[PDB]
Amino acid sequence: MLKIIIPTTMLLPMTWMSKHNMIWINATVHSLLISLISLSLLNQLGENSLNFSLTFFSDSLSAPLLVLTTWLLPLMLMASQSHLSKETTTRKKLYITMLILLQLFLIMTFTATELILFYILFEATLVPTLIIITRWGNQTERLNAGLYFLFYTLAGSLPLLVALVYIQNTTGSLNFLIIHYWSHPLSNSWSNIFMWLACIMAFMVKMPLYGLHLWLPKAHVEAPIAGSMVLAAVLLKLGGYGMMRITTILNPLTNYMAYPFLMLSMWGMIMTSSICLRQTDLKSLIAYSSVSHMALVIVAIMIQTPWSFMGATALMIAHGLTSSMLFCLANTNYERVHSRTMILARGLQTLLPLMATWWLMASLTNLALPPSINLIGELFIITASFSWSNITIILMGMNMMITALYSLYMLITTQRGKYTHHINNIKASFTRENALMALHILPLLLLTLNPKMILGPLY
Amino acid sequence: FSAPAAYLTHQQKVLRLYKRALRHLESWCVHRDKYRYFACLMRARFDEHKNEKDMVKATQLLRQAEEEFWYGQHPQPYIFPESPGGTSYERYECYKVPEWCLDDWHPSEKAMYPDYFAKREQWKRLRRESWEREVKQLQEETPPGGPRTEALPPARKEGDLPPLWWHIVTRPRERPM
Amino acid sequence: YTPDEKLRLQQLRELRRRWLKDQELSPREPVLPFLQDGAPWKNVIYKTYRHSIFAVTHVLIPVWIIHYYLKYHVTAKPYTVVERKPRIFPGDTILETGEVIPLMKEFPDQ
């Protein structure tokens, strides 16, 4: 696995020792090369995981996420080139290094074989994120947003540390393979209930469960574009990956302990989609849409059926791509009008035609249009939940309807109508932004030809 | 359009009702001969009490007509195509590109319309020079406590253009295509 | 109209008409200066040639490709092209032959 870790580390001295006219170019070149190399990790075996060594391993769950991170880093660089153009060279290098450290930490989380190493790195991801959100954010709310995010994550994760150490002491090991083979049923005692909670709430905070989701809108709104990109694409899927990894040792107590979280997510999807129906900030609308989409992944993980896990993996990948692209489009609009108000700039379908097509395709993917992987994941989760209980279909259908409603409402409000008269600074879209949207969309559409790659280890 | 007023007089409101009544009558009486017959009868009613001088009674005359009009109002009155509520309302709004978008063209694009862009720059020069006069002129004619109506002054002297003219003059046409 | 309103409207009308007349193309608009429109398309046949090359490139190549895919796929994998069994009436078959006519009643009327 070091074939990906070592170049990621070498990115730092490269950027630090590169000329001020070549940081972005070199970073993009070698991040894209790293993604190309990490594409080799998709050759997963049917039954056994790829055990590179004692410390790192990868299965059909880790590989798609690793590829997504290695692919998203260049996209973040391209999106963050614009506003970080008048910054000094040292701060640009610092921002690039923060992004690289975040990517490295994400890789080592998705490849870790030890639960405690996974925890260490998955909590280490906070520091680069928090710095990015509180240092290069534009608003004055970036300070409160960073605190909310950091403290929600830590208050969720510290009991997870306690529980992991307790499990290490009792079972003797935290290795995923051993903890999977030497698995044992959990009794219905209060101690097991609280161990289950300690293991679950940490990831429930990460992928925002309805009620613990208040940090996501602040974090996604106040952070810069690249920060929002990671937070939406990978930092939310961290919780899902952790939950899918740890649910092995949390049975059969889950059957009875999942009801509160299942109900919370199945109602919060509707609540957050309705909130999206009545949002005035584009980034806030996208963040609440992300909450609504991750509610389905939470449900799928808490049901623990093979179709649910496949749908969860597919939805994670698809939602990461779609949310990142939506945030990039909103960033372009913001950099054009210097405001995040949705109703401020209207009739953009007549001034930026290709950007309108990008918005249309992104919204279609967001509302789970067949045969996109978004729909593949959503339909798999819906079938799994229907098998779990037939009543679930009502909430699932209502959520789908409201998602289509608010996505098309965003499309109509932004890229339709009469152009805003007074706004005169809307210049023709650059090649960089269009290339960013194309690099967001094309892998997403291509994955529908080979959906088996992102369907998880249970395919 | 034209600048509105703070209120509509009893004369204005009666005329407004009259046009609505005839247009709704046209919608009801589809046949042209049929409409013309009842148009004079409608005209007679608006002339039965035209000379009424009691404004209290005159207002009461208006009130009864509006209640009669609303109850007899056509549920689906005829609307002109290029009118609010019409089938062709705002149909070409997606083609009305504002003029400032031309400044963002590539030089190669501008090289294909040299005569137009050259004449366009002359229009820009006119706006740039005349703007100081318009700023000056507005301040003079404006009452001290700002304006109280949306009506704008014309060009009082020679070598001057009506203040705030650019958008009204360089507005997109109805069929930009 | 008040006199100021009428005068302003007249001046705006003059400026608007001047602008509209300005919005008129000259006798030419320079188009940038076509190997495929040279020797291949000097005055190539705008009839049979076009209506045959379109037919080729739109039906003949696709039908060849699809039929070849229906050599790559149909007999290389079972239960891929399943045809409904042809209806069998009191008539002769092909490979095995044979027939059984049914016993018939008789009603010439209607």
Binding site: - | C101, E109 | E24
Partner: peptide, 12 residues
């Protein structure tokens, strides 16, 4: 009379 058509920049 051929009238100039006001369009956004399509070159980019």
């Amino acid at each position: 009379k051929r009238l100039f058509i006001i369009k956004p920049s399509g070159f980019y």
